[PDB]
Amino acid sequence: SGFLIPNAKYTTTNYFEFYLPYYWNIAPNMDATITPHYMHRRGNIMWENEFRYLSQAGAGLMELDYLPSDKVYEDEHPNDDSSRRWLFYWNHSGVMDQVWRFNVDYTKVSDPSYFNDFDNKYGSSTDGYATQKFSVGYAVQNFNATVSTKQFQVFSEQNTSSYSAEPQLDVNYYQNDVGPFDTRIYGQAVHFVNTRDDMPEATRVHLEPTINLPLSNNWGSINTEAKFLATHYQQTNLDWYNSRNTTKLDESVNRVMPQFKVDGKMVFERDMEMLAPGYTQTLEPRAQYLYVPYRDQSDIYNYDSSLLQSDYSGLFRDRTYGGLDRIASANQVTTGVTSRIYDDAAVERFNISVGQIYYFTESRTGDDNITWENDDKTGSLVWAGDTYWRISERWGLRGGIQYDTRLDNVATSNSSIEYRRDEDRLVQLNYHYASPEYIQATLPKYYSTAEQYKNGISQVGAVASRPIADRWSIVGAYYYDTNANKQADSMLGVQYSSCCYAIRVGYERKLNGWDNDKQHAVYDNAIGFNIELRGLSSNYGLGTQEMLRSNILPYQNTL
Amino acid sequence: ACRAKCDWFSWLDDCA
Amino acid sequence: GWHLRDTTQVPSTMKVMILDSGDPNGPLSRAVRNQLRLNGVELLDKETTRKDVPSLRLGKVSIAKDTASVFRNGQTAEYQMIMTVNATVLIPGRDIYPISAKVFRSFFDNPQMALAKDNEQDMIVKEMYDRAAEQLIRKLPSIRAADIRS
Ligand SMILES: CCCCCCCCCCCCO[C@@H]1O[C@H](CO)[C@@H](O[C@H]2O[C@H](CO)[C@@H](O)[C@H](O)[C@H]2O)[C@H](O)[C@H]1O
Ligand SMILES: CCCCCCCCCCCCO[C@@H]1O[C@H](CO)[C@@H](O[C@H]2O[C@H](CO)[C@@H](O)[C@H](O)[C@H]2O)[C@H](O)[C@H]1O
Ligand SMILES: CCCCCCCCCCCCO[C@@H]1O[C@H](CO)[C@@H](O[C@H]2O[C@H](CO)[C@@H](O)[C@H](O)[C@H]2O)[C@H](O)[C@H]1O
Ligand SMILES: *Cc1nc(C*)nc(C*)n1
């Protein structure tokens, strides 16, 4: 086709930026866009190319941005070979014939400081790493086999060492007519490779046959499950690690372990005539017993096992860590209770869940390095709770809290209250808290020792959006950190929508980095002007929704 | 690793 | 005034139904089929000649992963994951009733164990579908309440 209408902006990182997009309708179900983006501080034109396509394999979008030379980057890195910057992005997803599944999520940048300097369309300055994943899968009603590759480019210059699966094959098989029992089998073959040439490399082969007997009534349910876990590890390039650590990794490792889990739920109902005529209240208790014997996993390097968050839903999870490198022993009982309140039309209006985990014996993975605030090992250690209340068709409220006895404090908490008359007219308040003890426990040591990490999280966010005269839309957002008493994100936006065009003016002041010299955060102020031509589509919205997604902390509908 | 005498199907702590 | 639930979770009219989706082998369809089989519901093929049977069509599934909170340097700390699922339950005589499910999850980010975090994210997704399935089942009675009134 032809040229699009240009847009512009002023930022504190690039001064005046001018965009000159050009559309290119190459054919049906595939088009392209070429954008010269002139930046004045760097004094050069970033050539951006976008390619959107549809095909039998699915739908995909590619992006390639290239800046041949940079002035700020040249000044900051005088000994660098070249100052060119580039970005490659590819997002593809498709299902062919209902059985073949293709997924691609690939992002690559020249340097870790790319997203702090340029616009955030497929990336962001809040991202800590870039993901490069390919996956091809074959799925039928009782079978699925997926082969995928995962690589990660880490931006933080603390430790660039990372692990990648190249490749990882997962196989799942099911059979639900083996007498009264339901059986399934899971298998995996993974190759772990590290970017550094001195880190260990591994090959893991895992098998997991599980058999479960479910039983149900109109008022109760009970499911028993027995599973076996067989894992074989082949580890190489482990001379360097063994040379400095007392704990020695083994080349060939075999880990065989059973697991027994019994879950049960009850449902009680009553007609809450005291509060409202015809309203129903359901009290659902739930219990679970989990037993997995200890296995010394100190001679297996941790490649993809990390501690998992324990919300109310996560209290009944059968695993403490993701992946399969660390499998903590367990002799525990989880007990929870959920109360729901339905109106006359059988529509759920209120729910509140509270649960806890009781440990009969300590959960040991063989290699215990977590730094807790106390030496509590057995007893009611983990408590979780959540609530969701629909006060009306416009008011909604959500909340969640997680308390851990070993931290001697509330581990995490979050809350939000939203009013929403329509897509355009809305207000929302939210709060997020993560204690410093939780940050120290479930993160690296330099997180605990860093000034920008050790304070934890205490963030209060306000969002508002209102239309005026059926043609103007005003959107505002303000996220503020109570610990430092400093703003984290701030955004304003005004859009005027007409019959054939829409004019949008936006402004955002956001946290953008850290100044190690003076030890204070860096803020990036941007203000952009963008006009778009209407009339070619039935879209007559006021633009509030995509304006609310512009900032680094995008709006999410909590109903 | 493991021990001198261990059972693959054990159900006990140290593969007893 | 408490008492045990004397009625089944799925309504008696929807005991035998048809599960139709555009991704029958997808994780959401598998989770919904497993949840329906848990409640003693008999699922038929979409080509079934039996009439007057309610039909549940699963709509688009959207998964978003945004940043909820950030550190003092602007790096993300908490990732909030949102799952939105839509479906329509058609009673062939009466009408089509739309239902939807929203699942909220969150997890902390750690670049140094980033691959492990990705595995955790996958596990979270494998949880969320199941939760969404339960939510859809929990709106099965209300549709019945929407049918008797008309
Ligand atoms: C679905 C809900 C019902 C599930 C079934 C009931 C589960 C609870 C019983 C688990 C059996 C294990 O036994 C339960 O835990 C430990 C052993 O593990 C016992 O504890 C005993 O042995 C342990 C050894 O581990 C000693 O450290 C402890 O000092 C001693 O009291 C508890 O006294 C008992 O309550
Ligand atoms: C339905 C079950 C309950 C969950 C429902 C949702 C309710 C919770 C959401 C609101 C969160 C309030 O947050 C809760 O109070 C404050 C922060 O506000 C923190 O409380 C803090 O108080 C003081 C002063 O800062 C500190 O010395 C203390 O150590 C710390 O705990 C809690 O650790 C946090 O958990
Ligand atoms: C829910 C309501 C949402 C709307 C409210 C949020 C939008 C209002 C703007 C708040 C942010 C403005 O930021 C506030 O003022 C100016 C910028 O204006 C910042 O100060 C800045 O000034 C200029 C930009 O003009 C920069 O060159 C300078 O380096 C910087 O200090 C202050 O340090 C901050 O206190
Ligand atoms: C490594 C190992 N070896 C044996 C014999 N048994 C177990 C459970 N584990």
Residue numbers in the entry:
A (entry chain A): 226 to 784
B (entry chain C): 1 to 16
C (entry chain B): 1000 to 1149
Which text from the study accompanies this structure?
LPS biogenesis systems are essential in most Gram-negative bacteria, with LptDE responsible for the delivery of LPS to the outer leaflet of the OM. These β-strands are connected by turns on the periplasmic side and extended loops on the extracellular face that fold over the lumen of the barrel and require rearrangement to allow LPS molecules to reach the external surface.
All five imaged molecules (Compounds 1–5) in this epitope had an aligned sequence contacting the β-barrel of SfLptD, with a ubiquitous W×(D/EE) motif making a consistent interaction. The remaining residues of the five Bicycle molecules aligned poorly, especially in the regions facing the detergent micelle. Compounds 1, 2, and 5 were subject to an alanine-substitution experiment – residues highlighted in green could be substituted with an alanine with little to no effect on binding affinity to SfLptDEFL, residues in yellow resulted in a marked decrease in affinity and residues labeled in red were not tolerant to substitution, completely losing any binding to SfLptDE. Mutation of the key residues in the W×D/EE motif resulted in significant aberration in peptide binding to SfLptDE; substitution of the tryptophan residue with an alanine abolishes binding in SPR while substituting the aspartic/glutamic acid residues with an alanine significantly weakens peptide affinity to LptDE.
